[PDB]
């Protein structure tokens, strides 16, 4: 480059930031997800679609793990996922050479959201389009938050993203409450999973991460045949 | 219109403006004729004085004891183009200890004026030039250009109104092989005396003389010496 | 070239009585390959079809009599022989077939006012077997037209 | 509509979409050619055919397979400038694995090397996304043949039988007519059908003078460009 | 218009039309053909001389880069001088590092990159060139390459440059390739300048002709041009 | 540390001991000092050994990525000349004597040495290391031009025999290996 380095993204007049709420759209669209904390582990699911038969399921993963202990999902676009997800792979290295012990879930995302904040400011590029769902069960307590194109962080129970997001928080609303188990946690996501889904809900249009306090664990697709079996 | 304000920039007719523009800013300076023989490379430049008390300006300029300039353009792309022409002589007088061939001197300054001629926010160097130098092959006379071709021609006329003065050099291009010095340069002056309107001529005050030779540094002659070369002229007919 | 392909032709229908039949199956592989190959001027599509209706005037002439189930089988070892020696197309769309089954059925109505049944729907079942599942493609279709009228 | 510079730059729209990757896509279709790609039990098959115009021209200089590794080809479509400033990026970044890592580079972890720079220049504003595609095909251990798919936005996965260039909505929908009825595939099965999907969708029927095949098999993972002489051996063998 | 101010820009059916601007700046530029024999390459430049307006001999657009390496450049004559310093510059790494001379194919893909960087950026423009490579070996034959203003190169027998580039392949694909001399090729290449460009526009106009192959044991120079000139003696018995 | 290569009418004959020293410990009865850098072209290592190891990947890296690029399978002097890059710009900073040998298509089999200053030269015959300077007088008695396969394969075994005998550096086993336009034919000797 040059040694232009201006920013693309000023205030409007009315005092709104343009671009972000623009790559808000972009997220608004994107494939659905759930995501669930039930005082014992939370459960991330996404939703999997592959536009023909033609499609491999072995080789693309939504569900993306970070330490041993910490997973990732996401519901925006595709290509700028797998940026920060390298991006936050590393980050939690320099933690874990320094300090000798695991990265607490609340220190990853004080972190992934300061490069991405970070990001906006610096010119000549744009917003990422990617909001995510870290989760982990660090210290006994479990935890789940939520990022964002602007770089803002919070503390769900229980939230949705993607399409029809709206849709499935009231659902959600209704359907969770003070505490359940691990098992009935998955039982309800993927209940508000098959709230805009379409009709065939295989072990491969769905796709399942959970968080023991024993660790991080992604769901094989045998078990996902076996737990969908009177779904919802 | 919009695509004639960068270099950068092409035209849908297949033409860069910026470059098309430079040469018009030669056109604005005054006239000078460049020509040679078997032995010598005489140029003859036209000063031009700002007014009636003011110096008249400068055209041609040293360079090495072998070659020497004139000048088209604006003045500090003319010395901006001088400095770096004084310096690539003397890096070979001091690495080789030989005196550069001319030929090879003006690769260097295609290649030099090419760049900001090619990146964005650089400016093409609006000069033209007429270099005159001598070496183991004999004299040259080389002109150049804002778009960065230089030309081995054999006679050459730049600045305002020098067409009349290569009309001049067509039809006695033939001559000026077998002519020494005297009917080599008052050759030359009958070029640029074209290029005047008729109510004034060469004064001397206001043409400079530049040979390079065989035996023969490269001298510049302004004033006092011009004298002995401005006689045996005519005026010119009606 | 297809002076070489006249001169054989003139060869044949002289001596289809003297000379054995086999020697036609021996000429057989030599009038594939002159229709195999196709060029400017020499051989062209309309000599080749004139050479195949020499031929097959020669195996109906020597198929006139009671013994008619030789011209229907080296014909069809004929195509069954140009299909794998070939790519997908024969050699063209027309001449070599259209003509020939116009000629076979011009020749069917012909016998049929003379010859008994057998051999003739001999010779419409061997061909309603070859234009159900070989040449079914338009251009033309009249010559099947005639042939479902004259069989019927 | 257009807010700012958003059908200049790479920024979003209102919408929430942005235009000059989507511009991208359809500047492969300028190249006008047509490469598909088949995987079966135990190989993987690339057929492309050429175009050649000009009689002073060669016959070597031209076909787009590549070869990155002994191990892996690919074919490139899009505008021919563009996809040999991609193929040297993986060649460059294939022997990159072998020195820093010890082993053979996996087909699949390539392909991220790749979208991972492609997104990069969709990102940073002040150039240009590269418009064409990729293809790659390989042999793992204890995973078999794989079949991937770069694309100038930056997103890849796997197939088992998907083309690309020109044609697709037609090339890929006989494909799903083809997979989905449950065949054999062996070798000759999978090469036959990588040339009549390529026939019936272009509808030429040729002469084996154009298209050229980069099958790998399990048994000899090296790379292969097949001959003239046995591409015309296996075309007249599917001819009945 | 509106997108066709950047080499960064796509257009919305997805071209770039600063590519293509460029394109056509070269084929306003007087004409080169190159064409090889079986033990040779031979080139030719039509060069015109307005009245007098230099020397003979002045600006040739036969550069020389490497010992067996040869140029025959056609557009904006400033930047063709760049690329050969380029090119000069490329072969002498090469002899650097390894130690034997420049192959033909690397020195087209080196210095074709270098042409498509040109293409990415908004700092930079394309260049307006377009040029012929030639040479020849013992261990490799004679080789002949074309390079585009987008950066597109590969391998001919025959190509032209400049305002006659359609009219003046037309004959050249009338020859033969394989069964010709040079020498007989060297008359052969002087008619077809002789024959394109008739003098309505430009009364004067020169032939450069150079000549790399199994006579000049490899070297590239310039024909012998006042020695023998067999060609123009040859070429102007096509009056009628 | 003995190696040792011998030329002939087809391709070329390498050789070498076995014996890694710490100076009066040995840390490795058994060592490949002969390295594959490509299918036709061996090297066989000398003097350090964090050294050689470090340059012979380099090498193996660099003419890797070159002859994919070029598409054809390499030349022997062309490998040659990326040893003496590196030895000659890092003279100060390395104690390596390499032996390049291998088979080529163009010019048949090669022999090169590029000894620590970092200059090269081909040879008919070529020997290194530290046991080497006990074998230059049989070397220069035995050798005779033209011989075939089987003769350069009895001509190293005798040659580093004598060396591992009366050298104390140099010892183990003995591994040979011939390089020809066929293939690649490795053994391991002793006696």
């Given at each position: 480059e040059r040694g232009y380095s201006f920013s693309l993204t000023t205030f409007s007049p009315?005092?709104?930031?343009?671009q972000i709420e623009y790559a808000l759209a972009a997220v608004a669209g994107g494939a659905p997800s759930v995501g669930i904390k039930a005082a014992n582990g939370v459960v991330l699911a996404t939703e999997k679609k592959q536009?023909?038969?033609?499609?491999?399921?072995?080789?693309?993963?939504?569900?993306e793990p970070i330490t041993k202990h910490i997973g990732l999902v996401y519901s925006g676009m595709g290509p700028d996922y797998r940026v920060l997800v390298h991006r936050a792979r590393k980050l939690a290295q320099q933690y874990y050479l320094v300090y000798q012990e695991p990265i607490p879930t609340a220190q990853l995302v004080q972190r992934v959201a300061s490069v991405m904040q970070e990001y906006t400011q610096s010119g000549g590029v744009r917003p990422f389009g990617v909001s995510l769902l870290i989760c982990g069960w660090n210290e006994g307590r479990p935890y789940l938050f939520q990022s964002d194109p602007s770089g803002a962080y919070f503390a769900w129970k229980a939230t949705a993203m993607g399409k029809n997001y709206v849709n499935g928080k009231t659902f959600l609303e209704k359907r969770y409450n003070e505490d359940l188990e691990l098992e009935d946690a998955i039982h309800t996501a993927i209940l508000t999973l098959k709230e805009?889904?379409?009709?065939q809900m295989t072990e491969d249009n769905i796709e399942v991460g959970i968080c023991n306090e024993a660790g991080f664990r992604r769901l094989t697709p045998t078990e996902v045949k076996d737990y969908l079996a009177a779904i919802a | 219109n919009q695509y004639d304000n960068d270099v950068t920039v092409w035209s849908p007719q297949g033409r860069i403006h910026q470059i098309e523009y430079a040469m018009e800013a030669v056109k604005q300076g005054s006239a000078t004729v460049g020509l040679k023989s078997k032995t010598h490379a005489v140029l003859v430049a036209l000063k031009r004085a700002q007014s009636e008390l003011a110096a008249h300006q400068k055209k041609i300029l040293h360079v090495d004891n072998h070659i020497g300039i004139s000048i088209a353009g604006l003045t500090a792309d003319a010395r901006l183009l001088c400095n770096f022409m004084r310096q690539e002589c003397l890096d070979s007088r001091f690495v080789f200890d030989r005196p550069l061939p001319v030929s090879r001197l003006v690769s260097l300054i295609g290649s030099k004026t090419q760049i900001p001629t090619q990146r964005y926010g650089r400016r093409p160097y609006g000069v033209g030039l007429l270099i005159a130098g001598y070496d183991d092959m004999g004299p040259h006379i080389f002109q150049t250009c804002p778009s960065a071709n230089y030309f081995d021609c054999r006679a050459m006329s730049i600045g305002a109104r020098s067409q009349s003065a290569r009309t001049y050099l067509e039809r006695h291009?033939?001559?000026?092989?077998?002519?020494?010095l005297n009917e080599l340069v008052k050759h030359g002056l009958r070029a640029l005396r074209e290029?005047?309107?008729?109510?004034q001529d060469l004064t001397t005050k206001n043409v400079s003389i530049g040979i390079v030779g065989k035996d023969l540094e490269f001298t510049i002659y302004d004033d006092d010496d011009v004298s002995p070369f401005l006689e045996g002229l005519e005026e010119r007919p009606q | 070239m297809a002076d070489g392909g006249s001169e054989r032709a003139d060869g044949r229908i002289v001596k289809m009585e003297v000379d054995y039949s086999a020697t036609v199956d021996q000429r057989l592989p030599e009038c594939a390959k002159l229709a195999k190959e196709g060029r400017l001027?020499?051989?062209?599509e309309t000599l080749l079809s004139l050479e195949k209706q020499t031929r097959t005037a020669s195996d109906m002439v020597s198929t006139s009599?009671?013994?008619?189930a030789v011209v229907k089988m080296c014909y069809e070892a004929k195509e069954w022989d140009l299909l794998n020696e070939?790519?997908?197309?024969?050699?063209?769309?027309?001449s070599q077939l259209k003509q020939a089954v116009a000629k076979m059925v011009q020749q069917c109505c012909t016998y049929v006012e003379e010859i008994t049944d057998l051999p003739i729907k001999l010779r419409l079942i061997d061909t309603l077997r070859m234009v159900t599942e070989?040449?079914?493609?338009?251009?033309?279709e009249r010559a099947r037209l005639t042939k479902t009228l004259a069989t019927i | 509509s257009s807010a700012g510079f958003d059908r200049h730059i790479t920024i979003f729209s209102p919408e929430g979409r942005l235009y000059q990757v989507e511009y991208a896509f359809k500047?492969?279709?300028?190249?006008g050619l047509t490469s598909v790609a088949v995987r079966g039990k135990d190989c993987a098959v690339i057929v492309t055919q050429k175009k050649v115009p000009?009689?002073?021209?060669?016959?070597?200089?031209?076909?787009?397979?590549?070869?990155?590794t002994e191990n892996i080809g690919c074919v490139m479509t899009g505008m021919t400038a563009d996809s040999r400033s991609q193929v040297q990026r993986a060649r460059y970044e294939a022997a990159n694995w072998k020195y820093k890592y010890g082993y053979e580079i996996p087909v699949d972890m390539l392909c991220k090397r790749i979208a991972d720079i492609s997104q990069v220049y969709t990102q940073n504003a002040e150039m240009r996304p590269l418009g064409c595609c990729m293809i790659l095909i390989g042999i793992d251990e204890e995973q078999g043949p794989q079949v991937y798919k770069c694309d100038p936005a930056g997103y890849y996965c796997g197939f088992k039988a998907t083309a690309a260039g020109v044609k697709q909505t037609e090339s890929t929908s006989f494909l799903e007519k083809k997979v989905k009825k449950k065949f054999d595939w062996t070798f000759e099965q999978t090469v036959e059908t990588a040339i009549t999907c390529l026939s019936t969708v272009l509808s030429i029927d040729f002469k084996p003078s154009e298209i050229e095949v980069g099958v790998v098999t399990v048994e000899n993972p090296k790379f292969r460009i097949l001959t003239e002489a046995e591409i015309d051996a296996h075309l007249v063998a599917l001819a009945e | 218009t509106g997108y066709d101010l950047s080499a960064s820009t796509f257009s919305?059916?997805?071209?770039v039309f600063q590519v293509e601007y460029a394109m056509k700046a070269v084929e306003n530029s007087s004409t080169a053909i190159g064409i090889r024999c079986k033990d040779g390459v031979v080139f030719g430049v039509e060069k015109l001389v307005?009245?007098?307006?230099?020397?003979?001999?002045?600006?040739?657009?036969?550069?020389?880069?490497?010992?067996?390496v040869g140029m025959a450049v056609a557009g904006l004559l400033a930047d063709a001088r760049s690329l050969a310093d380029i090119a000069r510059e490329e072969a002498s790494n090469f002899r650097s590092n390894f130690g034997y001379n420049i192959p033909l194919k690397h020195l087209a893909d080196r210095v074709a990159m270098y042409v498509h960087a040109?293409?990415?950026?908004?700092?930079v423009r394309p260049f307006g060139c377009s040029f012929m490579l030639g040479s020849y070996s013992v261990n490799d034959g004679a080789q002949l390459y074309m390079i585009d203003p987008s950066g597109v190169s590969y391998g001919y027998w025959g190509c032209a440059i400049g305002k006659a580039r359609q009219a003046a392949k037309t004959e050249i694909e009338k020859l033969q390739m394989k069964e010709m001399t040079c020498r007989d090729i060297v008359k052969e290449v002087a008619k077809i300048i002789y024959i394109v460009?008739?003098?309505?526009?430009?009364k004067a106009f020169e032939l450069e002709l150079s000549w790399v192959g199994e006579l000049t044991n490899g070297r590239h120079e310039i024909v012998?041009?006042?020695?023998?000139?067999?060609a123009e003696k040859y070429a102007k018995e096509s009056l009628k | 540390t003995t190696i040792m290569a011998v030329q002939f009418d087809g391709g070329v004959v390498l050789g070498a001991d076995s014996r890694t020293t710490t100076g009066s410990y040995i840390?490795?009865?058994?060592?490949?000092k002969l390295t594959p850098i490509h299918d036709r072209i061996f090297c066989c290592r000398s003097g350090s050994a964090a050294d050689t190891q470090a340059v012979a990947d380099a090498v193996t890296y660099q003419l890797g990525f070159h002859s994919i690029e070029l598409n054809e399978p390499p030349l022997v002097h062309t490998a040659a000349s990326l040893f003496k890059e590196m030895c000659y710009r890092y003279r100060e900073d390395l104690m390596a004597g390499i032996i390049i040998a291998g088979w080529d298509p163009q010019e048949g089999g090669q022999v090169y040495s590029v000894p620590m200053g970092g200059m090269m030269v081909r040879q008919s015959f070529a020997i290194g290391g530290?046991?080497?300077?006990?074998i230059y007088g049989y070397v220069d008695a035995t050798y005779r031009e033209g011989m075939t396969k089987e003769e350069c394969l009895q001509f190293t075994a005798n040659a580093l025999a004598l060396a591992m005998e009366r050298d104390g550096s140099s010892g183990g086993v003995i591994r040979l290996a011939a390089i020809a336009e066929s293939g690649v034919e490795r053994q391991v000797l002793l006696g």
């Open positions: 009315s005092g709104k930031l343009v536009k023909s038969i033609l499609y491999d399921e072995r080789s693309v993963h939504k569900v805009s889904f379409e009709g | 291009m033939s001559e000026f092989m077998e002519c020494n290029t005047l309107p008729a109510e | 001027q020499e051989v062209i009599r009671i013994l008619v070939n790519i997908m197309l024969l050699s063209k769309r027309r070989g040449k079914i493609y338009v251009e033309i | 500047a492969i279709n300028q190249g000009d009689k002073l021209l060669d016959s070597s200089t031209v076909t787009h397979l590549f070869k990155i | 919305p059916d997805g071209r307005l009245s007098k307006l230099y020397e003979e001999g002045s600006n040739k657009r036969l550069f020389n880069v490497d010992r067996h040109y293409t990415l950026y908004s700092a460009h008739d003098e309505v526009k430009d012998p041009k006042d020695i023998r000139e067999e | 840390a490795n009865r058994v060592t490949d530290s046991g080497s300077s006990y």
